[PDB]
Amino acid sequence: HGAIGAKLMEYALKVRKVFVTGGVDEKMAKDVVQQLHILASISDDPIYMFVNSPGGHVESGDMIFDAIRFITPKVIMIGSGSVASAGALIYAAADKENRYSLPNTRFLLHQPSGGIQGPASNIEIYRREIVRMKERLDRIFAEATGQTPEKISADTERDFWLNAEEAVQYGLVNKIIVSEREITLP
Amino acid sequence: HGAIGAKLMEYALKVRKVFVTGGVDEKMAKDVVQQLHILASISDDPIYMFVNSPGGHVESGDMIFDAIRFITPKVIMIGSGSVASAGALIYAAADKENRYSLPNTRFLLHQPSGGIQGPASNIEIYRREIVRMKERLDRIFAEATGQTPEKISADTERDFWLNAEEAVQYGLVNKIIVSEREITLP
Amino acid sequence: HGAIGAKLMEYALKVRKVFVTGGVDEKMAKDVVQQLHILASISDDPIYMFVNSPGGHVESGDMIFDAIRFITPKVIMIGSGSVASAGALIYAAADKENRYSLPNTRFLLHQPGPASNIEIYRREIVRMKERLDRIFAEATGQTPEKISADTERDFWLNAEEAVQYGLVNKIIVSEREITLPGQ
Amino acid sequence: HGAIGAKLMEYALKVRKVFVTGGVDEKMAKDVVQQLHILASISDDPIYMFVNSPGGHVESGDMIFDAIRFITPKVIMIGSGSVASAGALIYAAADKENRYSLPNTRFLLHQPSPASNIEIYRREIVRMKERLDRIFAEATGQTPEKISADTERDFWLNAEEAVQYGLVNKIIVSEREITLP
Amino acid sequence: HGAIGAKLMEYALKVRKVFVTGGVDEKMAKDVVQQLHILASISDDPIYMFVNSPGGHVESGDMIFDAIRFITPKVIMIGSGSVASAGALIYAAADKENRYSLPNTRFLLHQPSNIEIYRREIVRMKERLDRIFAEATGQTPEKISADTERDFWLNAEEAVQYGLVNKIIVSEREITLP
Amino acid sequence: HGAIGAKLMEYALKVRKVFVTGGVDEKMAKDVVQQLHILASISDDPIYMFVNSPGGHVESGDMIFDAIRFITPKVIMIGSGSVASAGALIYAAADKENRYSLPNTRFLLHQPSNIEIYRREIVRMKERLDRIFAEATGQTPEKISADTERDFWLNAEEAVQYGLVNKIIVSEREITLP
Amino acid sequence: HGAIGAKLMEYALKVRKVFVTGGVDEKMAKDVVQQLHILASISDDPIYMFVNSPGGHVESGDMIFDAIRFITPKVIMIGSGSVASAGALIYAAADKENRYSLPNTRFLLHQPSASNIEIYRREIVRMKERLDRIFAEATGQTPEKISADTERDFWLNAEEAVQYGLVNKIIVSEREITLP
């Protein structure tokens, strides 16, 4: 399937569309980041990103988030199906006015804390990274939604899901759409 | 066999034909969704979709359904053989006037819902998704056929099959054809 | 060997030749159906299909059958070696005047959980057998009842018997012996 | 090695040369049959086939034989090394005047070979031997009975004996010695 | 996925971007060294190198370091995620004015890991690395050596204060070409 | 490595160069035979063949030998490293005037139903090889047969005296086209 | 990963650069020798070879050495990091005036090494004597001086390698290369 995927990749790049489908792992993040940088070098025109993901590696979500924020082109974010954990972090990288959702999309902002591994010598090092990461994520979603970090931290549990209309009221989604014609470019 | 599939993919894309054959899985959905978006960026001309599928993952059929609805080009839907479950969901995405069938095609609207897997903490969440999905599927097929959601729900059990003529009377199929010359484009 | 097959695929498409060789499975059906539709989008010119198959999945044969009938180009059907079961179903999709065979080709027609679900599965097999009886009746001019009586065992035909039965129109050894529809 | 074989295939097609090397199996037959048909659709010009094979599956040799006979271009047959069993069946598909051999080539015409369907297997074995005898009879100018009497497991022909037998037209050492029809 | 990786690498080269992602191994050194030399043969225009690496083989980092220093184009270094060990050696090859980091990047310096001769070779490599990082940061070799005895982690702001990172950025628009 | 080898093969064909490296097996024989026939269809110009092989299957070498003799272009034979067994048979297909060697090359002439008939075929093959090398070197078949009973190694200068190698060279400029 | 290497080789061929990076093995030698012959067929223009190798296969270095000597284009040799064993033999194939080194480069010129043992012995002697003469000719030292140094592992830094005759010039920029 590599040959088919490579061919679809090439065509998707030519039409400035990026797909984040399924679990976010290092292989996807590596491909998505390069795609974004390639597209940004080709033109400043918008890039369309389609997200339908149940979660994945947070460092992989972080890489995509950082690349979206880094490049000059605006990323038009279309969420569908489930947008959970690493997928929701990715979704939040786009500017508010460019965040769309289909009517049936469900959003989960909680990020799994992950597992520790390594020497016990450096447990203090592990502690501060846990605190730092939670505080970073709270600020990201607070800034993305207009909520306070405390509200984000309080609201964000393992089972706090938002449907598309709830995500609009919460500040995560700008507009619910069913057709690409309903997108308004900046 | 990747090289053959990639070459046939390239040619099929150039003639705006998409094939949904066999079980609808995540791998099929990723490819089909990208094909549809690629074709829509190239032009607004119609896309031909050929469906012959005994079922599959409802979430994968749902992704293709959403993409058909999202893009601007009209999808010309030709059903052959068996059009069941996830394949019938895909079939129903096209506008009524663009839904064709071969004489021997059999349609099953029932969607199997089994296969739930995950933490026990998410037991309540799984309950509501089952209810929400059944209600969405009833309304999708009601809008596609002109039946009420209650009539769809009453009728569409595991053993409720429609032949091509019954599917036309039911509102699912617009025209039974044996030749591509019998298609009338919108 | 994928790269070699892919390049031979590309050249065969350019000369409008499709090869159905070996067991008919879902993988072949996916490829042959795509090839037929690609060729039909390119032009209405005839398509040459070479069939040498010992059998396979009937539903996969059905997909190829339906595609042959659906597209506008006429499919010129050349049978070699064995034309059996799913392969004979594919062969029967072409118009009679376009059904050729080599002299040595042999043709074979043959019938394709709990106690409740086997009963429903039975009714599906009966449905499939009766549809196949009618397809071959229409292709040969025999009655469905005759097809059904002959096909409850392994009914093998040599090329000359296949001509007499109505399945094969003309026995040939050279492509020069093909007459395209309308000359 | 797929990429190498595919690039050489493309070049070989452009110069109308087909190679039948090693054991004749289903994969070789599929490739060779397609090449022959592609070349025939491109032009009626001759096709050069180089055969060096110890044998293989007869259905595969038969497929190549049938394709050689079916297409319009004449196949120029150059045999080297060992041309045995399925390989000899392929070689015999070309017209006599187009069958060449290198000096060291050895030819073997002998072809090797559910309880319910035992009667069917028997009849196919008889049917196949009879087709092979007549194929080689026509190709050589011998009678089918003479082919049948002579061809056994250890009946090898050298190039000079194969010329005398009617199998080979001319022994050559250079491609310049080929005469096209 | 080789076909996908090959296609993206090619498009990235055409826009003069090099990705150093994941573990630094011999295969990466082979590829990155070639990419750098290919880009240098095409023009003297800057090259953008994106580094996110949790570590790897120091000798392979060294090959990339030497190539960065040798070619004529300036390498613009953008660190993100982790810039550790061999990856930090690669990062330090760029001129200070061209070393950028995202705010969340963390940096790790650490000493590399008959018997006497191998010792003398390890010491030589440790001494070479101390001086490389001393010259890159403005710290003394003794400070580099003392800090790197064990795993010395720096966040982006600490890395700026240390001399490893010149400027913290979130946008490519905050890069200035030299 | 298929993609790299396929790339290098393509460029080598465009310059009429064929590389015979490593074990001589059926796959290599098929490729080399096709390459030679492709080059012969394109033009009658010379073909350069580079042989460095530790051995392999004699029938696979025999196919390459036959093709070299059959095609119209002259094959210019350059031996290096090891030219052994199947590789030596290939080497011997070229005309004497076109057999070159590097100074360090070593050459090895290695000999290959019923048990009786399998014997007679091996004897048939051995005798054919004796005559091939006899004609290529100017030695008698009996001398060849006796020398190849064991593992008969020759250095490049011994190979010249033996008649297998015509000229020892270090530069391609020392090649004279016939 | 074959595709990545294949694409980079294509680009490297166009800019006449050949890489000997990492361990010298047989698969590397096969590719480099062919590349050199392809580049030689394209033009007589110089070829740049970048050598940064800690060692490798004894016979594979010779293949590259022989090909460098065989082709007509002059090979511009740039040694970096460690140039040891097979890498040093390859390095020595270039003309003296075309042998460059980075300031930190280290060079090691010493090469590591059933019935008839006598044949095995004489080839070990043959190889050591072959190598002594190659490095003697490449540096201007005597074979006996070379032979004395190659008893164990005798390392040279860039400045030591220049005085020894192995390296012509230490450079830091490609602009410092002077074509012949």
What DSSP string describes D106-172? EEE-------TTHHHHHHHHHHHHHHHHHHHHHHHT--HHHHHHH--TT-EEEHHHHHHHTS-SEE-
Q: Which residue in B47, F136, F120 sits closest to C41, CA to CA? A: B47
Q: Which residue of E has its CA nearest to G78?
A: E70
Contact between A161 and B125 using a beta-carbon 8 Å cutoff? yes
Q: Which residue in F25, F82, F95, F83 sits closest to F58, CA to CA? A: F25
**Residues from B in contact with C at Cβ < 8 Å:** 1-8, 11-12, 15, 17, 19, 21-22, 50, 52, 78, 80-81, 102, 104, 159, 178-181
Chain B residues touching A180 at Cβ < 8 A? 40, 70-72
Q: Are D99 and D51 in contact (CB under 8 A)?
A: no
Chain F residues touching D154 at Cβ < 8 A? 113, 117
Contact between B22 and C30 using a beta-carbon 8 Å cutoff? yes
Q: How far apart, in whole angstroms, are the C-alpha atoms of residue D129 and residue D151?
A: 11
Q: CA A166 from chain center: how many Å?
A: 18
Chain A residues touching B122 at Cβ < 8 A? 159
Q: Which residue in A53, A61, A55, A60 sits closest to A78, CA to CA? A: A53
Please state, in angstroms and as integers, the Cα–Cα distance from residue F172 to each residue in B113, E127, F167, G13, following that order: 74, 46, 12, 20
Interface test with A, best of B10, B28, B37 (most A CBs within 10 A): B37
Contact between G173 and E70 using a beta-carbon 8 Å cutoff? yes
Question: Residues C71, C77, C82, CA angle at the centre, nearest 5°?
Answer: 130
Contact between B102 and C66 using a beta-carbon 8 Å cutoff? yes
Q: How far apart, in whole angstroms, are the C-alpha atoms of residue D106 and residue D126?
A: 27
Q: How many residues are recorded in chain D? A: 181
F43 φ, ψ to 5°? -170, 170
Q: Which residue in F124, F59, F127, F34 sits closest to D82, CA to CA? A: F59
Q: Which residue in E10, B94, B107 sits closest to G7, CA to CA? A: E10
Chain B residues touching A52 at Cβ < 8 A? 63
Q: At what angle do helices F141-148 and F115-137 cross, to 10 degrees?
A: 120
Q: How far apart, in whole angstroms, are the C-alpha atoms of residue A184 and residue A78?
A: 12
Element (H, E) at F47: strand F47-53
**Which residues of D are the active-site residues?**
85, 110
DSSP state, residue C171: E
Q: Count H helices, E strands: chain D? A: 7, 7
Element (H, E) at C135: helix C115-140
Relative to beta strand B161-163, strand D75-84 is: unpaired
Largest CA distance in chain A: 57
Q: Which residue in C83, C111, C86 sits closest to C167, CA to CA? A: C83
Question: Residues A169, A173, A175, CA angle at the centre, nearest 5°?
Answer: 95
Q: At what angle do helices E115-137 and E141-148 cross, to 10 degrees?
A: 120
Q: Are D111 and D84 in contact (CB under 8 A)?
A: no
Contact between D71 and C11 using a beta-carbon 8 Å cutoff? no
Q: At what angle do helices D2-14 and F2-14 cross, to 10 degrees?
A: 30
- For the record, the structure tokens of E109 come out as 């310096």
Q: Are E110 and E89 in contact (CB under 8 A)?
A: no
C125, C130, C135, C140 alpha-carbon torsion, rounded to 10°: 130
**What are E106's strand-pairing partners?**
E82, E155
Q: Which amino acid is residue G119, in one-letter code?
A: I
A23 φ, ψ to 5°? -65, 130
Residue written as tokens 């015409």?
A: D109
- What b/e readout covers E110-119, taking b as 16+ CB neighbours within 10 angstroms? bbbeeeeeee
Please state, in angstroms and as integers, the Cα–Cα distance from residue B153 to each residue in B131, E40, G140, following that order: 12, 67, 95
Residues followed by a gap in chain A, C→N > 2.5 Å: none
Chain A residues touching E1 at Cβ < 8 A? 2, 5, 27
Question: Across the interface, which of G26, G59, G71 has its CB nearest the CB of F172?
Answer: G71
Which segments of B71-122 does DSSP mark as H helices, in order?
Answer: 86-91
Q: Which amino acid is residue C75, in one-letter code?
A: V
Question: Across the interface, which of A34, A42, A62 has its CB nearest the CB of E19?
Answer: A34
E116 φ, ψ to 5°? -60, -40
Q: How far apart, in whole angstroms, are the C-alpha atoms of residue E7 and residue E5?
A: 6
Q: How far apart, in whole angstroms, are the C-alpha atoms of residue A12 and residue A37?
A: 14
Reported resolution, Å: 2.0
Q: Which residue of G has its CA nearest to F48?
A: G37
**Residue G3, CB half-sphere, CA atoms under 13 Å: how many?**
13
Contact between D81 and F71 using a beta-carbon 8 Å cutoff? no
Nearest chain B CA: its distance from A4 CA (Å): 4
DSSP state, residue E158: H
Q: Which residue in E98, B41, E13 sits closest to A34, CA to CA? A: E13
Contact between B13 and A11 using a beta-carbon 8 Å cutoff? yes
Chain F residues touching D81 at Cβ < 8 A? 59, 62-63, 66
Judged by DSSP in three states, A58 sits in helix
Judged by DSSP in three states, G172 sits in coil
DSSP state, residue D56: B
Q: How far apart, in whole angstroms, are the C-alpha atoms of residue F18 and residue F48?
A: 6
Please state, in angstroms and as integers, the Cα–Cα distance from residue D65 to each residue in C18, C101, D132, D170, F104, following that order: 19, 15, 11, 21, 49
Taking residue B136's Cβ as centre, other Cβ atoms within 10 Å add up to 14
Chain A residues touching E52 at Cβ < 8 A? 63
- For the record, the structure tokens of B164 come out as 């091509």
Q: At what angle do helices C2-14 and B2-14 cross, to 10 degrees?
A: 30
Q: Are C142 and C165 in contact (CB under 8 A)?
A: yes
Question: Across the interface, which of E8, E21, E170 has its CB nearest the CB of A38?
Answer: E8
Taking residue F3's Cβ as centre, other Cβ atoms within 10 Å add up to 23
Taking residue E90's Cβ as centre, other Cβ atoms within 10 Å add up to 30
Judged by DSSP in three states, E31 sits in helix
Judged by DSSP in three states, C144 sits in helix
Q: Which amino acid is residue G171, in one-letter code?
A: I
Nearest chain G CA: its distance from E113 CA (Å): 17
- What b/e readout covers C37-72, taking b as 16+ CB neighbours within 10 angstroms? bbbbbeeeebbbbbbbbbbbbbbbbbbbbbbbebbe
Q: Which residue of A has its CA nearest to B133?
A: A104
The sign of the CA dihedral B123, B126, B127, B128 is: positive
Judged by DSSP in three states, D108 sits in strand
A180 φ, ψ to 5°? -60, -25
Instruction: Report long-range pairs for C171-178 (Cβ below 8 Å, ≥24 apart).
Output: C171/C100, C171/C101, C171/C102, C171/C103, C172/C78, C172/C100, C172/C101, C172/C102, C173/C102, C173/C103, C173/D69, C173/D70, C174/D69, C174/D70, C174/D72, C175/D40, C175/D70, C175/D71, C175/D72, C176/D72, C177/C100, C178/C76, C178/C78, C178/C100
Q: How far apart, in whole angstroms, are the C-alpha atoms of residue D111 and residue D125?
A: 11
Question: Across the interface, which of E15, E21, E81 has its CB nearest the CB of A41?
Answer: E15
Q: How far apart, in whole angstroms, are the C-alpha atoms of residue G168 and residue G166?
A: 7
Q: How many residues are recorded in chain B? A: 186
Q: Which residue in G112, G6, G122 sits closest to G61, CA to CA? A: G112
Q: Which amino acid is residue B161, in one-letter code?
A: W
Q: Are B47 and B75 in contact (CB under 8 A)?
A: yes
Do E and D touch (≥3 CB pairs < 8 Å)?
Answer: no
Question: Across the interface, which of F2, F12, F81 has its CB nearest the CB of G34?
Answer: F12
DSSP letters for B51-77: EEE--B-HHHHHHHHHHHHHSSSPEEE
Q: How far apart, in whole angstroms, are the C-alpha atoms of residue A34 and residue A11?
A: 15
Q: Are F45 and F11 in contact (CB under 8 A)?
A: no
Q: CA F136 from chain center: how many Å?
A: 11
**What are A100's strand-pairing partners?**
A78, A175
Question: Across the interface, which of B5, B41, B125 has its CB nearest the CB of A4?
Answer: B5
Give the list of residues 6+ apart from residue A163 with CB closer than 8 angstroms, or none: A105, A106, A107
Q: How far apart, in whole angstroms, are the C-alpha atoms of residue C107 and residue F122?
A: 45
Q: Which residue of D has its CA nearest to C4?
A: D6
Please state, in angstroms and as integers, the Cα–Cα distance from residue C114 to each residue in A18, B108, C118, C124, C125, following that order: 47, 21, 6, 16, 16
Judged by DSSP in three states, E68 sits in helix
Element (H, E) at D71: none
DSSP letters for F86-127: HHHHHHHTS-GGGEEE-TT-EEEE-----HHHHHHHHHHHHH
Q: Which residue in F6, E63, E30 sits closest to G19, CA to CA? A: E30
Residue written as tokens 């090359």?
A: F105
Please state, in angstroms and as integers, the Cα–Cα distance from residue B52 to each residue in B19, C33, C66, G24, following that order: 8, 11, 11, 55
B181 φ, ψ to 5°? -65, -15
Q: Are B88 and B52 in contact (CB under 8 A)?
A: no
Chain E residues touching A6 at Cβ < 8 A? 3-4, 6-7
**Residues from F in contact with D at Cβ < 8 Å:** 2-3, 5-6, 9-10, 13, 26-27, 29-31, 33-35, 37-38, 40-42, 59, 62-63, 66, 69-72, 113, 117, 128
Taking residue E9's Cβ as centre, other Cβ atoms within 10 Å add up to 20
Please state, in angstroms and as integers, the Cα–Cα distance from residue G104 to each residue in B105, C146, E69, F77, following that order: 75, 91, 12, 42
Give the list of residues 6+ apart from residue B38 with CB closer than 8 angstroms, or none: A8, A11, A12, A15, A17, B13
Q: Which amino acid is residue F46, in one-letter code?
A: P
Contact between D41 and C17 using a beta-carbon 8 Å cutoff? yes
DSSP state, residue F74: P
Q: How many residues are recorded in chain C? A: 183
Nearest chain C CA: its distance from D161 CA (Å): 30
Give the list of residues 6+ apart from residue A49 with CB closer than 8 angstroms, or none: A17, A18, A19, A20, A68, A75, A76, A77, A78, A90, A94
Q: Which residue in C2, G128, C183, G54 sits closest to A4, CA to CA? A: C2
Q: CA E177 from chain center: how many Å?
A: 19
Q: Which residue in D174, D48, D18, D171 sits closest to D102, CA to CA? A: D171
Q: How far apart, in whole angstroms, are the C-alpha atoms of residue A140 and residue B44?
A: 38
Judged by DSSP in three states, A181 sits in helix
Q: Which amino acid is residue D133, in one-letter code?
A: D
Give the list of residues 6+ apart from residue C21 with CB closer than 8 angstroms, or none: C50, C52, C53, D30, D33
Q: Are D108 and D85 in contact (CB under 8 A)?
A: yes
**What are C161's strand-pairing partners?**
none
DSSP state, residue F174: G
Judged by DSSP in three states, G79 sits in strand
Q: Judge whether E85 counts as a catalytic residue.
A: yes
Q: How far apart, in whole angstroms, are the C-alpha atoms of residue B109 and residue B88?
A: 6
- For the record, the structure tokens of B165 come out as 């003529």
Q: CA C45 from chain center: how many Å?
A: 20
Nearest chain F CA: its distance from D2 CA (Å): 7
Q: Judge whether E110 counts as a catalytic residue.
A: yes
Interface test with D, best of F14, F21, F35, F41 (most D CBs within 10 A): F41
Q: Are B29 and B65 in contact (CB under 8 A)?
A: no
Q: How far apart, in whole angstroms, are the C-alpha atoms of residue F105 and residue F170?
A: 11
Q: How far apart, in whole angstroms, are the C-alpha atoms of residue C62 and residue C53?
A: 14
Please state, in angstroms and as integers, the Cα–Cα distance from residue F55 to each residue in A179, F87, F127, G61, following that order: 67, 6, 19, 20
Q: How far apart, in whole angstroms, are the C-alpha atoms of residue B102 and residue B71?
A: 26
Catalytic residue among F53, F85, F101, F145, which?
F85
Which segments of chain E does DSSP mark as H helices, in order?
Answer: 2-14, 26-42, 58-70, 86-92, 115-137, 141-148, 156-162
DSSP state, residue C177: G
Q: Are D48 and D18 in contact (CB under 8 A)?
A: yes
Nearest chain D CA: its distance from C117 CA (Å): 30
Give the list of residues 6+ apart from residue F17 with CB closer than 8 angstroms, or none: F47, F48, F49, F50, G37, G38, G41
- Gyration radius of chain E's alpha carbons: 16
- Gyration radius of chain F's alpha carbons: 16
Q: How far apart, in whole angstroms, are the C-alpha atoms of residue D27 and residue C36?
A: 23
Q: How far apart, in whole angstroms, are the C-alpha atoms of residue F61 and residue F112?
A: 11
- For the record, the structure tokens of A16 come out as 């400035």
Q: How far apart, in whole angstroms, are the C-alpha atoms of residue E60 and residue E73?
A: 21
Q: Which residue of F has its CA nearest to D4?
A: F6
Q: How many residues are recorded in chain A? A: 186
Which segments of chain A does DSSP mark as H helices, in order?
Answer: 2-14, 26-42, 58-70, 86-91, 123-145, 149-155, 164-170
Q: How far apart, in whole angstroms, are the C-alpha atoms of residue F60 and residue C52?
A: 32
Taking residue F56's Cβ as centre, other Cβ atoms within 10 Å add up to 23
Q: How many residues are recorded in chain G? A: 180
The sign of the CA dihedral A124, A130, A133, A139 is: negative
Judged by DSSP in three states, D155 sits in coil
Residue written as tokens 């490389």?
A: E132
Q: Are D54 and D83 in contact (CB under 8 A)?
A: no
Catalytic residue among E60, E85, E101, E145, which?
E85
